[PDB]
Amino acid sequence: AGTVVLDDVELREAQRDYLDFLDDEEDQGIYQSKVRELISDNQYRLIVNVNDLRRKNEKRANRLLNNAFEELVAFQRALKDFVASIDATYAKQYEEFYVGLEGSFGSKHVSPRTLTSCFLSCVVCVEGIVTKCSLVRPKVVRSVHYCPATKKTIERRYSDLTTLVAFPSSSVYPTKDEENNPLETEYGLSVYKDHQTITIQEMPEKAPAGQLPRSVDVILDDDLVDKAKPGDRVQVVGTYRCLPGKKGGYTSGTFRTVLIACNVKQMSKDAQPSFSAEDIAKIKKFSKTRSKDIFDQLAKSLAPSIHGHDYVKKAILCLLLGGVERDLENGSHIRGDINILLIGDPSVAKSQLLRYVLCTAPRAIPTTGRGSSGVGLTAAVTTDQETGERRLEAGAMVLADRGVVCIDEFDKMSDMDRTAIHEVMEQGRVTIAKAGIHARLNARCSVLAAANPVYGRYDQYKTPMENIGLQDSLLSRFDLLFIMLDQMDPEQDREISDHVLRMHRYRAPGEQDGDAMPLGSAVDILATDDPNFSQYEKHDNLLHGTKKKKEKMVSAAFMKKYIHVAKIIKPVLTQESATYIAEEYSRLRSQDSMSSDTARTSPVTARTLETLIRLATAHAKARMSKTVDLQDAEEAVELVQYAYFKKVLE
Amino acid sequence: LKDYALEKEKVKKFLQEFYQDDELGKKQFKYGNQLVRLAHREQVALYVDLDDVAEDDPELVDSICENARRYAKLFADAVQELLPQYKEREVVNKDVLDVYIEHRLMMEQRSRDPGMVRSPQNQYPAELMRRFELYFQGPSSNKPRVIREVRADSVGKLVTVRGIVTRVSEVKPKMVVATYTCDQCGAETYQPIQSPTFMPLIMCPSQECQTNRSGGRLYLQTRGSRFIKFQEMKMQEHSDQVPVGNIPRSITVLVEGENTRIAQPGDHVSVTGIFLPILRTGFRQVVQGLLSETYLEAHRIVKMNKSEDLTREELRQIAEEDFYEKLAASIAPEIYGHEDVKKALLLLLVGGVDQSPRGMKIRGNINICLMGDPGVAKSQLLSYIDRLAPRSQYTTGRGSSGVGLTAAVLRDSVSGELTLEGGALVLADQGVCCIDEFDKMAEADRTAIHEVMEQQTISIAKAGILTTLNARCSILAAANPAYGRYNPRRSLEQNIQLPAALLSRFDLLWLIQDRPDRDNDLRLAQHITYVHQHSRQPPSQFEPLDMKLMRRYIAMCREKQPMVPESLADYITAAYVEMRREAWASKDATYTSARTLLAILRLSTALARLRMVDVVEKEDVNEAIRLMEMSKDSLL
Amino acid sequence: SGFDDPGIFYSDSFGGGQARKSQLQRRFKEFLRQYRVGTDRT
DNA sequence: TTTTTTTTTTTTTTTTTTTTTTTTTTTTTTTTTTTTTTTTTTTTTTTTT
């Protein structure tokens, strides 16, 4: 053969439609700005919301989603044309520009179980958990060969025939000149694109509870390779395709299918935020208006469904803001995470606070007493069994690096596990070694833990030392230790019960009118978008989640935005704050700090001094202060003074 | 694009007339002298510093870095063609490879007939005749890369990466040029080897056997063939360049030649090399295309921070009477207090001197157990000593237990068989093993540590393994004595809770207790707030030494074997018998044995090493005894 | 690595019954270059 | 310059050979991959005086 096409009508029309869609200037300017932004960010993939195409062109959107390969070829040619129009040299740098897809794939949004053969050559959106990743390998796309005898230089092109027919002429590597002079390959002048394969499995929480998991293979090519690691929950948008078998004279009719990714995005749509100019202005005004009691307002707005526990909510706000790590020049390290332990009577809502943090913070990992044992909590070392090499496996605390581990039923863990937690809790790292490999994994996680005292209910007539069952070294790791009692006072009972009944009465606004909460039975989730991978008035409207209109509460979305901005602040200890903190620490170390019939809940060590510093720093962050002023220090000291002592009754 | 004849002339000019003033402001033609040494077979590897090339041809450096195999070949050819005119005398034929080379050259000139045109396949391959290796020291203008980020866009480029060596194979003969001989003809056949495997030749291609149309079967021979020292190492990302939720990424480094036997497992190295593919033939691959494995082809391996391989004032502070105190106070200056603890840790770093009398080895290593209350910088001191010592390993709790401390037999990858890999106590052999949370260590590990601390070996007689490992490592342990806290209502040996054997193995059991104390708590809190405020320890009388300088001083003190005089024997004996009488008389004392006397002796020899004298003096003994006494001071 | 194929190289013979074709070709060559006509006076 | 026999000589074929071109064409082993056991090295819940 050797035929060329003379202005194919469908490809011409498609490229015209796609370039019309991309050239957004008479329209809102969205994708024209996006293409500028990839030029400036020095990238060559544009992610296109398919809903925008449906809005602009139903016919393109449907044809693209149902005939993915040639449509995507048209739309990448149109993208290259458009990029050249904006900037021809940038378009000259990259051989091809790519298009990823995003948005709402209605029936094309599948799971690895539901990705059947009717989606072949369609765009699909598959969600699952990465079970295995291959190594990132380079695949040669253009080899350059020098002939030392003739001084000639040769280039050979290898087209991407991953899912196409590949005749053997298409894969020969040149080794000889025409008259059998040897060629030497120019590695630096050749072009490679790196290639990866991952397997996506149906998420265990979404799989039918009875049977074995279903998987799909995914080919990742350049820009997309290291986007996912084993254990990650990801969306992969791409084309579902049959791979060719080898040449043979006989075939079973059986084909091996893969998904060729055009886009990979993490479930952590909570690990990447989006700030508009108005959002930033709102944050700045919220911080400037009341730069004194802003912390209290944020704390009291934290777990609105839980009544009470004002100090505990302040402490959780400090944990969510964190301190600042000290990275000394000689490589030494002081941690900047706050670890909190909640001891208390049954049914005082400490699991509710852990659940709130789980649904609120980014990179938050849940774990219960005996459901994460040994190597499931810190890292593990296993042997590859294919290459025979040792590999690392990240446990709960490595996966929560720069995040939170919410350890529920902390008292029901084994002592082996609780002593494995020590190094992560203080030095923020996991050190694991077998013979062929030794690593030091970063686990810079804060620990929010909830436990019951020994005897299940807290005895008020015993010291907190013997109600908590924890040894002093472990207790020292937790910088704040809250005893949450069930004081059966009638007045506090009235407060709690009125609150609880108001939350049991609340009905969502208009969305519901007397109806039930759907179970979400695995075909309903694929019907809509996944909120996990999905795409701000500073206050909530008041109805009866609160009794009366006397004090406003911060919006959850705005609070996420505000805390994300404030977490980056690095306030500095001022000399007055440092002197005050030092004096308070020396007072607190002393016996006069505790009266008679009051007892220490946890020991006061140098870790308590860093606790004061970290709490004061978090308080300063809440105000966006850039300095740790005396008010921050005294707030931290009252937190510590509250948590570290308990009156014992007779 | 570019003419390689012009480029070879460029590199010839650079080699011939590049000069510096390296030896005391003297222009010396840096690469000409090395070419002379290479021509006389007195030097094997030539390292071309691309900084030198950039000094007078920066675009040559850019070409080198963007196609590095080509320029390694061009530089090797230029050196080959320059060597004959830099030869001043006759090589003495150091080895057998030289005998083969000069017999081949002799016979080629003998039957030369120079004007004749030979076949292109009828000469010696260039790599068969070199005896020199050429490597690049990458320009300092190229920033070091992260192993994760060395990808397909850097194939064929000269890159530098940094990492920890996790696994390095033994040096093995990799064949470079296979040599065969014929049963008919008396010529030699040569098969240069680029692939990871080769198919040995069968027939010879000689002219005399092509004329005769004989069988001419050829026989593969190690004798005339050419091999190179070859190692395979794995190298891991540093903890500080791994992304947030990830594990470190390994790269395979193919080390060969004069670059072998530099990196051992656990070393922090910086490797310059070319990033190259290995074709993935054979594997019935899911994806069509030419997929390949990658590796780093090593050019320059440099051991970094703690693995790193003096001015008159320097010797001035070494000879200063306060050198011991200054070094000890440089130990983690961000931890306040712990002055004598830091002195003991310094002695552990220096160590005593091993004695081998009449076939009965007694170690020189010093072991120290810090058993203290919570939050007293034990883990910080352990971590500092791990950062500072040259061969140190840090282990915690039970994350590296069992074969993470001893050895395990593991499937080799290079050939494929069962190779022994050492754990922490082998990677820390002749260094420091920092064992944190010692009281919460699995009992099998504790028994292994018994044998390590006295015999300095690990004996294993499990199924796949029957060996004795060398573990000549000092042990720096940290523990909490009993229930987290020291309580005076109970004796030592009850809140120490170490068996007399294990307890006696430690030269110093340092007790730390943080009893509250208002002015002392203020001093600590001020120190800590300053550290949090400036990311450094507060100014003091004497600025603490750099870790590089501390390492240099400790290393100099290491090869300083001092002896114990006969004159001190009575003084030392009296000190020992005294310590032993308090142990017997006291009712709150730990186990005392002859190991206490050996501890005196090796502590005092470490002090003498710190004074860099060759004879232990009474003040060294005096300070050693004071340290042993302070180690149990907190219980007073 | 496993991309290029250098050739095979061989050397000349380093020395070492019924004459082989190599020896016969050598004798033919020496006849061509050593055959001699004429006489002492001519 | 009317009649008249050899002479070719262009046109039908036919032979006919020599040479180049054309036409035809599954089975059988091997090997990787996956999924199983199985001895051994730990290691995690069992109890006492």
Ligand SMILES: Nc1ncnc2c1ncn2[C@@H]1O[C@H](COP(=O)(O)OP(=O)(O)OP(=O)(O)O)[C@@H](O)[C@H]1O
């Ligand atoms: N202010 C409050 N105090 C106590 N309980 C509350 C409060 N507000 C709500 N609750 C409700 O109490 C119920 C039980 O709380 P939860 O299960 O979180 O208790 P818990 O402390 O985890 O108990 P346990 O220690 O046994 O696990 C929850 O349904 C929660 O909604």
Ligand SMILES: Nc1ncnc2c1ncn2[C@@H]1O[C@H](COP(=O)(O)OP(=O)(O)OP(=O)(O)O)[C@@H](O)[C@H]1O
């Ligand atoms: N002089 C000092 N004494 C005690 N603690 C200090 C001192 N200087 C700093 N610190 C702080 O102590 C904190 C660390 O606790 P550390 O590493 O001491 O635990 P540890 O000694 O191993 O105790 P545990 O027995 O609980 O494991 C560090 O953040 C460090 O900044």
Ligand SMILES: [Mg+2]
């Ligand atoms: Mg609970």
Ligand SMILES: [Mg+2]
């Ligand atoms: Mg510690």
Ligand SMILES: [Zn+2]
């Ligand atoms: Zn031969």
